[PDB]
Amino acid sequence: VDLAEVEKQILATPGVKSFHDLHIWALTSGKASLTVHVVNDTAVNPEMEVLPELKQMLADKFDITHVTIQFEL
Amino acid sequence: VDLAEVEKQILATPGVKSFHDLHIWAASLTVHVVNDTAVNPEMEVLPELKQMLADKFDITHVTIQFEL
Ligand code: NI
Ligand code: NI
């Protein structure tokens, strides 16, 4: 997992203003686990309009399928 | 940490319908919450869960994902 591409792809996602507290570590299984705090734009409900896009991108681009994404304004 | 008491308090929170993928390790907590679909959980649920986990369990390193 290239942490720079992960950061770039998070900030490249429509409706993402910023992020912090990105953690990416290996589970016992050796599979990637990710947590992140995302500040979404005021115009989008991120549950509907950002979360599915971040899930899709993290799976497709990084093979990360164990995700917990929190949104703040 | 009593996961049974964490479970009760999460489910006791207004706007919470269910949760899964609760993980607590050295304390850090992650969880997936299904909110009531009539509630945007970003203002009506998230701060409430964060203050409850702080008050009741001394847990402040939290990541809560709302979905479904
Ligand atoms: Ni945060
Ligand atoms: Ni889930």
UniProtKB/Swiss-Prot annotation, chain A:
This is Metal cation efflux system protein CzcD. It comes from Cupriavidus metallidurans (strain ATCC 43123 / DSM 2839 / NBRC 102507 / CH34) (Ralstonia metallidurans). Belongs to the cation diffusion facilitator (CDF) transporter (TC 2.A.4) family. SLC30A subfamily. Induction: Most highly expressed when the upstream czcCBA transcript is not induced. It is found in: Cell inner membrane. Coiled coil: none annotated. It comes from the Bacteria. Disruption phenotype: Mutant is impaired in metal sensing. Deletion leads to partially constitutive expression of the Czc system due to an increased transcription of the czcCBA genes. Mediates a low-level metal ion resistance, probably by efflux of cations from the cytoplasm into the periplasm. Also mediates resistance to cobalt, cadmium and zinc via regulation of the Czc system. May repress expression of the Czc system by an export of the inducing cations. Binds and transports zinc. Can also bind cobalt, copper and nickel. The lineage of its organism: Bacteria, Pseudomonadati, Pseudomonadota, Betaproteobacteria, Burkholderiales.
Swiss-Prot record, chain B:
Induction: Most highly expressed when the upstream czcCBA transcript is not induced. Changing residue 61 to A: Lack of zinc resistance. Disruption phenotype: Mutant is impaired in metal sensing. Deletion leads to partially constitutive expression of the Czc system due to an increased transcription of the czcCBA genes. It is found in: Cell inner membrane. Disulfide bonds: none annotated. Mediates a low-level metal ion resistance, probably by efflux of cations from the cytoplasm into the periplasm. Also mediates resistance to cobalt, cadmium and zinc via regulation of the Czc system. May repress expression of the Czc system by an export of the inducing cations. Binds and transports zinc. Can also bind cobalt, copper and nickel. Belongs to the cation diffusion facilitator (CDF) transporter (TC 2.A.4) family. SLC30A subfamily. This is Metal cation efflux system protein CzcD. It comes from Cupriavidus metallidurans (strain ATCC 43123 / DSM 2839 / NBRC 102507 / CH34). The gene is czcD.
